[PDB]
Coordinates of C-alpha atoms and ligand atoms in Angstrom, one line a residue:
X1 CA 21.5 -15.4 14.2
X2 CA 18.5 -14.9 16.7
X3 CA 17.9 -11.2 15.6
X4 CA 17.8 -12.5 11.7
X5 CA 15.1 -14.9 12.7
X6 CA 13.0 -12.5 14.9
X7 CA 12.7 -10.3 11.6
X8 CA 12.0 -13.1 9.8
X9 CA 9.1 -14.3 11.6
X10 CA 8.1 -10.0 12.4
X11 CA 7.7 -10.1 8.5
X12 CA 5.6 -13.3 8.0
X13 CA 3.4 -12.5 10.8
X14 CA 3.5 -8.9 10.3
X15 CA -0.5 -8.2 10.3
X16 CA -0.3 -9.9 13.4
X17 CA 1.5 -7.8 14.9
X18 CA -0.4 -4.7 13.0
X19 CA -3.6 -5.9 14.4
X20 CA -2.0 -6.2 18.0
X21 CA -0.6 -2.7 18.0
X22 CA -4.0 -1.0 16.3
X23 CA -5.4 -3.2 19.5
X24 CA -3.3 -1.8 22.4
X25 CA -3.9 1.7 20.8
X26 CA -7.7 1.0 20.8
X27 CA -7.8 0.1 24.6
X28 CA -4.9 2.5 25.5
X29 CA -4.9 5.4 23.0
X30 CA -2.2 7.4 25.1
X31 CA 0.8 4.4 24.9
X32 CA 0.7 5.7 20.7
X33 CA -0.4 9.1 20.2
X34 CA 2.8 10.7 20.7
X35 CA 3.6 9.2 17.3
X36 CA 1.3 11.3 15.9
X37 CA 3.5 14.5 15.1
X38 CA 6.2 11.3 13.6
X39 CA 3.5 9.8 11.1
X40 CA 5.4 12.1 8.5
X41 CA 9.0 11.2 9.4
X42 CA 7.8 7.6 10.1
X43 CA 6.3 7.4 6.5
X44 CA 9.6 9.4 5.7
X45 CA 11.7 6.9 6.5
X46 CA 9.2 3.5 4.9
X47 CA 9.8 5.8 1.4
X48 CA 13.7 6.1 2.1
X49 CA 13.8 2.5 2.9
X50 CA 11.9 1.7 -0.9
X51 CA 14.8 3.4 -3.0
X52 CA 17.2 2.5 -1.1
X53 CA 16.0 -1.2 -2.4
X54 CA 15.4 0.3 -5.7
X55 CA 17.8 -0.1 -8.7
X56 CA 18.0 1.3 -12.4
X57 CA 17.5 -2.3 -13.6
X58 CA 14.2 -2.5 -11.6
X59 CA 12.8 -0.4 -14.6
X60 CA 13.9 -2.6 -17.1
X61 CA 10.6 -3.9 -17.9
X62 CA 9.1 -0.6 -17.9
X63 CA 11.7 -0.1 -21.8
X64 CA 11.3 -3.8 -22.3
X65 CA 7.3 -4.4 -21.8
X66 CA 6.1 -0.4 -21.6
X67 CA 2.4 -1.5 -22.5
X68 CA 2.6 -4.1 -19.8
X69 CA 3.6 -1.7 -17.0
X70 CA 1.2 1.1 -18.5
X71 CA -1.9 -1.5 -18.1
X72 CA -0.9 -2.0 -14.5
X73 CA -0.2 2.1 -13.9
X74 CA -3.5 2.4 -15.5
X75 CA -5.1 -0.4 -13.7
X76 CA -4.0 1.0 -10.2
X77 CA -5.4 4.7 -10.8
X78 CA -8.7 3.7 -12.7
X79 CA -10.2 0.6 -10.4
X80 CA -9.3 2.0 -6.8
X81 CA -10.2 5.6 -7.2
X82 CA -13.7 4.6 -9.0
X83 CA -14.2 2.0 -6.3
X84 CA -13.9 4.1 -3.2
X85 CA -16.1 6.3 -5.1
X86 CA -18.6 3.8 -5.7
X87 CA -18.2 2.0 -2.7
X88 CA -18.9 5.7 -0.5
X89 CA -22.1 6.2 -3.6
X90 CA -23.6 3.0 -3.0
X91 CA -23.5 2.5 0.9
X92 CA -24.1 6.3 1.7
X93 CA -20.8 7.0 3.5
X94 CA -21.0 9.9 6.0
X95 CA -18.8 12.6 4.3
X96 CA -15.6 11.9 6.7
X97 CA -15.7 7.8 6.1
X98 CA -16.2 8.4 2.2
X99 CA -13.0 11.5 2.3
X100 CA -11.2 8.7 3.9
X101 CA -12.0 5.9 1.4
X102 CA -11.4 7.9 -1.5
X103 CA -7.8 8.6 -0.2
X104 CA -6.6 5.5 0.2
X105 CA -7.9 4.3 -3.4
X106 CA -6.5 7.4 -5.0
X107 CA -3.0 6.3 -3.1
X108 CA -0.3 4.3 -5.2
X109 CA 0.1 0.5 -4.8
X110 CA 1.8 -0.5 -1.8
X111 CA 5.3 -2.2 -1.5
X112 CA 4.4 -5.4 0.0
X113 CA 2.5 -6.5 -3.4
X114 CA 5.9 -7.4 -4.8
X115 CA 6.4 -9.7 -1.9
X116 CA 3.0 -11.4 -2.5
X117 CA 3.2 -11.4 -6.5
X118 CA 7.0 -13.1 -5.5
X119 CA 4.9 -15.8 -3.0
X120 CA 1.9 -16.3 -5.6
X121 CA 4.6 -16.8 -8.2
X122 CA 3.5 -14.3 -10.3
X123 CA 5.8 -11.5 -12.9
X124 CA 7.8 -10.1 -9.7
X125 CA 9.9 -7.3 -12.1
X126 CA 6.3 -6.0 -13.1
X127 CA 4.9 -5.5 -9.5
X128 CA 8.1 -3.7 -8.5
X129 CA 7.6 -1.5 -12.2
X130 CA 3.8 -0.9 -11.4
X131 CA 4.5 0.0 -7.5
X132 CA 7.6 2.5 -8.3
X133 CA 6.1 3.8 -11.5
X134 CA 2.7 5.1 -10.0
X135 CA 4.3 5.9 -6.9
X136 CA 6.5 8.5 -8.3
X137 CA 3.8 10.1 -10.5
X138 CA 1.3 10.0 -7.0
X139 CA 2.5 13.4 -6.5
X140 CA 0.4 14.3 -9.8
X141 CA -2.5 11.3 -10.0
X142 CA -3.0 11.4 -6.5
X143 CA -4.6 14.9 -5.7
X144 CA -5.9 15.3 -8.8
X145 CA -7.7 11.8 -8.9
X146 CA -8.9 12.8 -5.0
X147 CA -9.9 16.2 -6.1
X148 CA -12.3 15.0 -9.2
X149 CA -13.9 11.9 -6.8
X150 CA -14.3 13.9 -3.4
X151 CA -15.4 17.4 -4.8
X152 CA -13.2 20.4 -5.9
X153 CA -14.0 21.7 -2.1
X154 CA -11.1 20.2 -1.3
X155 CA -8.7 21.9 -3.4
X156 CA -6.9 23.7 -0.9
X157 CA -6.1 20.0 1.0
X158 CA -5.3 18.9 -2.5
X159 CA -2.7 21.4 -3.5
X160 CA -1.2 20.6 0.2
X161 CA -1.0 16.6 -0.5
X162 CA 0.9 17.1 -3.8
X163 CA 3.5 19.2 -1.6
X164 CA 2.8 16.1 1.0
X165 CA 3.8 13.5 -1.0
X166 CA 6.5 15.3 -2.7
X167 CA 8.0 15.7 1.0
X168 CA 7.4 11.8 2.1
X169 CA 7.4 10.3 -0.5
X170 CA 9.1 11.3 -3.7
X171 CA 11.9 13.3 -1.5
X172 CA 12.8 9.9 0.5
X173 CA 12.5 7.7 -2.8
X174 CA 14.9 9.5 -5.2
X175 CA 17.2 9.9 -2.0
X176 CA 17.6 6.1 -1.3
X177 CA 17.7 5.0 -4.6
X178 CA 20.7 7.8 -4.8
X179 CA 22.6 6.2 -2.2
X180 CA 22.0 2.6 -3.6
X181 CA 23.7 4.1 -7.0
X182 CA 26.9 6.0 -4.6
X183 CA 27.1 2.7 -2.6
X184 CA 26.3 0.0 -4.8
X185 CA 26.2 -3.4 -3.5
X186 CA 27.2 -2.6 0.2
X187 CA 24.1 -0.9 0.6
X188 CA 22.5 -4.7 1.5
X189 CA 24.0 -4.0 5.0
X190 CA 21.7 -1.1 5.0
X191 CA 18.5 -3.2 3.6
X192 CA 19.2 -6.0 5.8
X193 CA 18.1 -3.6 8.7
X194 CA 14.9 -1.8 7.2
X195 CA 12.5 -4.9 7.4
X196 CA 12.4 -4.3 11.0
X197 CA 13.0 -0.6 10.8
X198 CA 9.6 -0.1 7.8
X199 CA 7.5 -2.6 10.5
X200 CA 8.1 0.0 13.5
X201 CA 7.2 2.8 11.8
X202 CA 3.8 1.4 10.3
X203 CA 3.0 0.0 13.3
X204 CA 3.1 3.3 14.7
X205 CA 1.3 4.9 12.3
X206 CA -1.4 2.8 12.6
X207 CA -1.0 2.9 17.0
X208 CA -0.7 7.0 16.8
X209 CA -4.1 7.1 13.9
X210 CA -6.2 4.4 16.5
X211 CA -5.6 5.8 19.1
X212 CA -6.6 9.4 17.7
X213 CA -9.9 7.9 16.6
X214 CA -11.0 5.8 19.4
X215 CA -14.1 7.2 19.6
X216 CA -14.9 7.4 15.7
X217 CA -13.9 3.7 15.5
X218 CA -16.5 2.8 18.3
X219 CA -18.9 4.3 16.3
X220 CA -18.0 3.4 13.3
X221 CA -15.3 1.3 13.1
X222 CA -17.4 -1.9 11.8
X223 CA -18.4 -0.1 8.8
X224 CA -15.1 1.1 8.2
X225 CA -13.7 -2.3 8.6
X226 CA -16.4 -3.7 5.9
X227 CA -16.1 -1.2 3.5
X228 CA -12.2 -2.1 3.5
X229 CA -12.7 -5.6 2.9
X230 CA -15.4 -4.9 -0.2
X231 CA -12.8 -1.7 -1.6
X232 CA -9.7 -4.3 -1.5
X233 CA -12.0 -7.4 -2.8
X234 CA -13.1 -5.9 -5.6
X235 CA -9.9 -4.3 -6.1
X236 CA -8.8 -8.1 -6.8
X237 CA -11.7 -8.7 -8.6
X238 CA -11.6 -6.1 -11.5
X239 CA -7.5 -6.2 -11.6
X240 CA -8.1 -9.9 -12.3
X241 CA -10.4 -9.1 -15.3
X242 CA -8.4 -5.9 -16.5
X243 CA -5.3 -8.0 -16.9
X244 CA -7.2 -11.1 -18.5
X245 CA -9.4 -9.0 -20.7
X246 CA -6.0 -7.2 -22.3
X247 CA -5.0 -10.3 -23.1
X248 CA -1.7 -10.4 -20.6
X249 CA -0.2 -14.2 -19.6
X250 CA -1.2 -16.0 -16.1
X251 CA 2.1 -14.6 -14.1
X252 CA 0.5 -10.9 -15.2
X253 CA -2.8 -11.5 -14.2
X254 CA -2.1 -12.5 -11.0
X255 CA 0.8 -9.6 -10.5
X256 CA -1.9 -7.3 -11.4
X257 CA -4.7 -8.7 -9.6
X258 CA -2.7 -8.1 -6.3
X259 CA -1.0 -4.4 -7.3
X260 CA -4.9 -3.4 -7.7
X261 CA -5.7 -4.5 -4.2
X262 CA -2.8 -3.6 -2.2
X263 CA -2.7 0.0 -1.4
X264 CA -0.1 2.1 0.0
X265 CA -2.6 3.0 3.1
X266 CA 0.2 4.3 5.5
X267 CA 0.2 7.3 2.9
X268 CA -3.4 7.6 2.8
X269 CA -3.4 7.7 7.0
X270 CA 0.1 10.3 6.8
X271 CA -1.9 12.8 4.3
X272 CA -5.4 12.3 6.7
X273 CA -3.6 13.2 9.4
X274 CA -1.8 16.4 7.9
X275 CA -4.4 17.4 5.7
X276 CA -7.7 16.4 7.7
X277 CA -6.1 16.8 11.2
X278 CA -9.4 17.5 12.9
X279 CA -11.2 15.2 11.7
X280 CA -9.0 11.3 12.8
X281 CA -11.8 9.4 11.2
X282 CA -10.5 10.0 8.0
X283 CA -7.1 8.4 8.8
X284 CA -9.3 5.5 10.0
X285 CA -9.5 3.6 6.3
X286 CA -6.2 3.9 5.9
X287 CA -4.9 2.4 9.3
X288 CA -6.9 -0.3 8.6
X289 CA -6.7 -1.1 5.0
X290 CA -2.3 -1.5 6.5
X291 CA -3.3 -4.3 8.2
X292 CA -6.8 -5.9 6.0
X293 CA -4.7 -5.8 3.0
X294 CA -1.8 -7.8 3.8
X295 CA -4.0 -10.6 5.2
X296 CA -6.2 -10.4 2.2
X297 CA -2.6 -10.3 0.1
X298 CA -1.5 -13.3 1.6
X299 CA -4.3 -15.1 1.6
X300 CA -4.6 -14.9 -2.3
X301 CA -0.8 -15.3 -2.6
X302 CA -1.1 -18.4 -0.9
X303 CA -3.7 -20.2 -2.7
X304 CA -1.6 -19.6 -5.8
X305 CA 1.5 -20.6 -4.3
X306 CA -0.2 -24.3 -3.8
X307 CA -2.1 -23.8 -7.4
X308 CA 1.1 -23.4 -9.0
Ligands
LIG1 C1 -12.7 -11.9 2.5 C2 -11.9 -12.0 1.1 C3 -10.4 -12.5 1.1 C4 -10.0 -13.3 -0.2 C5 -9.9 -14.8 -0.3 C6 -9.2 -15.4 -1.6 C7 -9.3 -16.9 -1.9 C8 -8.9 -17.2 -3.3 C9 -9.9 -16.7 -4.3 C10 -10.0 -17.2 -5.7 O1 -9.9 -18.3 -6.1 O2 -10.1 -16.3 -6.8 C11 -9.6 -16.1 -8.1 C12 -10.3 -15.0 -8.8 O3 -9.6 -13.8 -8.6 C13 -9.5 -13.1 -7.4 O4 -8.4 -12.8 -7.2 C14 -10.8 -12.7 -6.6 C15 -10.5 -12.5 -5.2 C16 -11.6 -11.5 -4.8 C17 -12.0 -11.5 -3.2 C18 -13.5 -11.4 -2.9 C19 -13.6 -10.3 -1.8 C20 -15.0 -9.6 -1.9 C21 -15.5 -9.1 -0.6 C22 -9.6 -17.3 -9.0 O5 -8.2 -17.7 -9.5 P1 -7.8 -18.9 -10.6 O6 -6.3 -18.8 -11.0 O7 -7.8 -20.3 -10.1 O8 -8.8 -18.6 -11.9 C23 -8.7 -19.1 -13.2 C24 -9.3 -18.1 -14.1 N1 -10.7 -18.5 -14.1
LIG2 C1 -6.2 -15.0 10.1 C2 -6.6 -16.5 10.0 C3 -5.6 -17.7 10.4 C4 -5.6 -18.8 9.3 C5 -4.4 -19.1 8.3 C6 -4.3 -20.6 7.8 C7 -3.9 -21.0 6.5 C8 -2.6 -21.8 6.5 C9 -2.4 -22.3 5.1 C10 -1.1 -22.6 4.5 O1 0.0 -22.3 4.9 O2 -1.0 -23.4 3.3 C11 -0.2 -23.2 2.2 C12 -0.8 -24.1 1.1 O3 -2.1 -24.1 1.1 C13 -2.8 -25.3 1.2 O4 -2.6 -25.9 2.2 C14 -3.7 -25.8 0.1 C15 -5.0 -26.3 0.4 C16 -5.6 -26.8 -0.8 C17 -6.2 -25.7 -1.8 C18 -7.6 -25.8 -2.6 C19 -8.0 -24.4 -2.7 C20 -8.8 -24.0 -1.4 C21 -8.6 -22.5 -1.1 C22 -9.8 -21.8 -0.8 C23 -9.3 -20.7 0.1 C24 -10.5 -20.0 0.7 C25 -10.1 -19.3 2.1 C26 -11.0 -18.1 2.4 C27 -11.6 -17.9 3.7 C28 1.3 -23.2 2.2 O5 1.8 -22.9 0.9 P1 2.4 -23.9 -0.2 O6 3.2 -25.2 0.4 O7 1.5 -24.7 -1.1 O8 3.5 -23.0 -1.1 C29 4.8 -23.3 -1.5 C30 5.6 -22.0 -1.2 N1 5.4 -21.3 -2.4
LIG3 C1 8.2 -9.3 4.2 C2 6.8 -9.5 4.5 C3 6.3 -10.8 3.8 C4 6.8 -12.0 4.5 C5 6.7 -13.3 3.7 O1 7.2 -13.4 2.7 N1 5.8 -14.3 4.2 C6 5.6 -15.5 3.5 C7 6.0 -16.7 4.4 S1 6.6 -18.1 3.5 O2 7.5 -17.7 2.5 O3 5.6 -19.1 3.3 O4 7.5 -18.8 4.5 C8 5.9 -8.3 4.2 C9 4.4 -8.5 4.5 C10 3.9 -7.3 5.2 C11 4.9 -6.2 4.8 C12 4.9 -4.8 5.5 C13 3.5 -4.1 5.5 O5 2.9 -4.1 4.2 C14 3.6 -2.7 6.1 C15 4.7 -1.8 5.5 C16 4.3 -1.3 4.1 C17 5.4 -0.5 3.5 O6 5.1 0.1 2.2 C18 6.7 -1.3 3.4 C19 7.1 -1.7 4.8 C20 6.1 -2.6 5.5 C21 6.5 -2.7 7.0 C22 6.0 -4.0 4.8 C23 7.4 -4.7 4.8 C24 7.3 -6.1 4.2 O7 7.1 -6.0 2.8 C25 6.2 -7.0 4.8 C26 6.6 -7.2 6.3
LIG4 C1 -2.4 -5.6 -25.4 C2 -3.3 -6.7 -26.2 C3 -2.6 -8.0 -26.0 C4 -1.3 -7.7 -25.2 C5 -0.1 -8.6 -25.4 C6 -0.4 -10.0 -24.9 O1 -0.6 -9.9 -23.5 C7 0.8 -11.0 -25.1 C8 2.2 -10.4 -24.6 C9 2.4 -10.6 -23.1 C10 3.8 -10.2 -22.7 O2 4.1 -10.3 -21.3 C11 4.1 -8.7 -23.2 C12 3.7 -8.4 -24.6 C13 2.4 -8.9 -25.1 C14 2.5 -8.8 -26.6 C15 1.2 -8.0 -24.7 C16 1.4 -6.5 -24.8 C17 0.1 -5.7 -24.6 O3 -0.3 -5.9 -23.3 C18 -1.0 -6.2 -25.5 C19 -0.5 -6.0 -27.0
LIG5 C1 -1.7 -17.3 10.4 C2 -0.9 -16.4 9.4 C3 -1.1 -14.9 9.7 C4 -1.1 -14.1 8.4 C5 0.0 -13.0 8.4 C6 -0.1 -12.4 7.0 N1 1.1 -11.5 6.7 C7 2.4 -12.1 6.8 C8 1.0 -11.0 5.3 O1 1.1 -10.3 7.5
LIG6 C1 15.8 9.0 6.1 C2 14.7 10.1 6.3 C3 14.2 10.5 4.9 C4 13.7 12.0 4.9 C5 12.2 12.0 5.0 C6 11.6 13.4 5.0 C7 10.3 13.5 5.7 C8 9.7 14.9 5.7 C9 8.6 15.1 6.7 C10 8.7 16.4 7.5 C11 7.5 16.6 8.3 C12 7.3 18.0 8.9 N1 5.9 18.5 8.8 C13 5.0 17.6 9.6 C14 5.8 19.8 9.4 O1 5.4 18.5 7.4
LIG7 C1 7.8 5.7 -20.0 C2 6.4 5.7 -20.7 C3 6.5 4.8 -21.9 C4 5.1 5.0 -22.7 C5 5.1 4.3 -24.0 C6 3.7 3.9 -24.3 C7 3.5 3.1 -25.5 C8 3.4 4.0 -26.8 C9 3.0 3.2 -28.0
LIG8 C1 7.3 6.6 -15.8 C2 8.2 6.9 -14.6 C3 9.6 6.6 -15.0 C4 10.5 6.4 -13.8 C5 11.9 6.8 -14.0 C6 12.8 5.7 -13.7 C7 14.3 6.1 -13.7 C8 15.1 4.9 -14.0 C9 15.3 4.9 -15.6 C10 16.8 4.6 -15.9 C11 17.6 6.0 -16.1 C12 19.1 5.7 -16.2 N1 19.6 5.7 -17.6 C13 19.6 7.0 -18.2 C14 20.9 5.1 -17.7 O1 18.7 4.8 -18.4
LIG9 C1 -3.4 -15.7 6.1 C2 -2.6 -16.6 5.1 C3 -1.6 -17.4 5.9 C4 -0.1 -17.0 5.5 C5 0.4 -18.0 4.5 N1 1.9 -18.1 4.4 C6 2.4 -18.7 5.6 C7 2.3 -18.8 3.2 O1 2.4 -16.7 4.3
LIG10 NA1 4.2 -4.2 -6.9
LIG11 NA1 -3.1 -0.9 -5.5

């Protein structure tokens, strides 16, 4: 009864606790960065954890609605790719900062956007269709939208992020959602403890990528921080207006609006810190768009939650 209740409040306070651990890290970077050789298992186990909660009637709306999910899919790889690009153009980003912005807006949508489409009552089936659909084709889209915006220098990193991804992300997936079709409904014994389990891990990440960086972050960590808020604000902003100006209902727009922004940044810091290992700064925007976007996500949930 008491352990159900600690999760509960974990989950609804989870930035929180994100910004305490990134915190601890900062002042103590040792207490973390023996996570760092984990970031892939952690991130390993966060994927597992997503199939495992994913079902063949999930993707339902993806035959029922295909255009609908194909706006969002389309929505997701166009606006936060051409943002970091525009954001790193427009506010001359040193190299490092603007490889690490570009990342996290050419990673999929994050998980916790069908928890805030669910809390701004919004189209829930479509935010779990959009996250799972450009999710599993982020092996593809990913590398090759990061290779056109950072430069075809990086090709080498590039090639290694599609085998990345396949590894943490798409290996994990198809595994969970696997068992979730051998076990069927007994597998909520199983998803009653990842909540706590997904938490840990990111929180890690995050510690083990701070602590890493503490010196890059004094530098530079305010910009870093600034440039997240204006890459996941605008983000809301143009996923707002892509949904409206297709014409798709209220409960889309604001599904949409919040798929755009939310970011599956604890993959962006996972292929930093394999791919761009000696340089920690460009983990940096992605350890800190995993916190930044769930307060901005709730935040925006919850004045539609009172709206409607
Ligand atoms: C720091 C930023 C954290 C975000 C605070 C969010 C507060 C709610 C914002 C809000 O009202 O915006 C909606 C616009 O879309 C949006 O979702 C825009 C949010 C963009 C955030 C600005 C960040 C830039 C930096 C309007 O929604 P509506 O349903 O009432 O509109 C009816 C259609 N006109
Ligand atoms: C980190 C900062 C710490 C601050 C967090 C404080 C916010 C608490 C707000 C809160 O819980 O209120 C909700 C309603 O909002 C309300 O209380 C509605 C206030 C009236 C809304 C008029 C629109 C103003 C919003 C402009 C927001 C700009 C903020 C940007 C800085 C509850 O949810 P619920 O009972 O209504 O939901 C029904 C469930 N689904
Ligand atoms: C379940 C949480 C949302 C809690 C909530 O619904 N609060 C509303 C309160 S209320 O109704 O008004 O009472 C969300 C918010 C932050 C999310 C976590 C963070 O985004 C960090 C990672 C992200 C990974 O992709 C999924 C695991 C995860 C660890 C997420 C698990 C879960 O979706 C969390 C913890
Ligand atoms: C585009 C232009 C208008 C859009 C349509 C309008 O948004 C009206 C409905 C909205 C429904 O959720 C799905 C079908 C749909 C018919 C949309 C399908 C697709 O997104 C369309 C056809
Ligand atoms: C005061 C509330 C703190 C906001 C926490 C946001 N959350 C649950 C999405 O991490
Ligand atoms: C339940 C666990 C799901 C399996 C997740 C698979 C994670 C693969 C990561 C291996 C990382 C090794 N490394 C760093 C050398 O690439
Ligand atoms: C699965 C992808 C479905 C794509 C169909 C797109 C609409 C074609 C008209
Ligand atoms: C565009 C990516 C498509 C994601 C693939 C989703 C797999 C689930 C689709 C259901 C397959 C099971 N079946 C054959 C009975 O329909
Ligand atoms: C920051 C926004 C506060 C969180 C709102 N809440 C409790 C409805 O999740
Ligand atoms: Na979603
Ligand atoms: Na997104």
């Amino acid at each position: 009864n008491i352990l159900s209740k600690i999760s509960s409040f974990i989950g609804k306070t989870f930035s929180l606790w994100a910004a305490l651990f990134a915190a601890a890290a900062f002042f103590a970077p040792d207490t973390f960065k023996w996570a760092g050789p984990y970031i892939p298992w952690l991130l390993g186990i966060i994927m597992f954890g997503m199939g495992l909660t994913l079902k063949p009637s999930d993707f339902d709306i993806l035959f029922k609605h295909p255009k609908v999910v194909i706006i969002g899919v389309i929505a997701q790889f166009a606006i936060m790719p051409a943002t970091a690009w525009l954001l790193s153009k427009l506010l001359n980003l040193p190299a490092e900062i603007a490889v690490g912005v570009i990342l996290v807006g050419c990673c999929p949508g994050g998980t916790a956007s069908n928890v805030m489409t669910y809390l701004a009552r919004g189209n829930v089936a479509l935010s779990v269709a959009v996250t799972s659909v450009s999710t599993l084709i982020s092996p593809l889209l990913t590398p090759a939208i990061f290779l056109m915006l950072a430069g075809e220098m990086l090709e080498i990193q590039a090639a290694g992020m599609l085998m990345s991804i396949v590894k943490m992300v798409l290996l994990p997936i198809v595994l969970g959602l696997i068992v979730h079709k051998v076990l069927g409904s007994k597998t909520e014994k199983l998803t009653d403890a990842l909540p706590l389990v997904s938490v840990a891990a990111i929180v890690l990440i995050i510690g083990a990528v701070v602590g890493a960086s503490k010196g890059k972050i004094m530098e530079s960590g305010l910009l870093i921080f600034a440039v997240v808020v204006l890459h996941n604000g605008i983000g809301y902003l143009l996923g707002f207006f892509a949904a409206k100006w297709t014409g798709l209902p209220y409960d889309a727009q604001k599904t949409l609006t919040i798929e755009v922004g939310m970011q599956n940044s604890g993959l962006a810091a996972a292929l930093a810190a394999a791919h761009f290992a000696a340089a920690p700064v460009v983990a940096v925007p992605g350890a800190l768009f995993s916190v930044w976007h769930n307060i901005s996500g709730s935040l925006l949930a919850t004045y539609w939650a009172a709206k409607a």
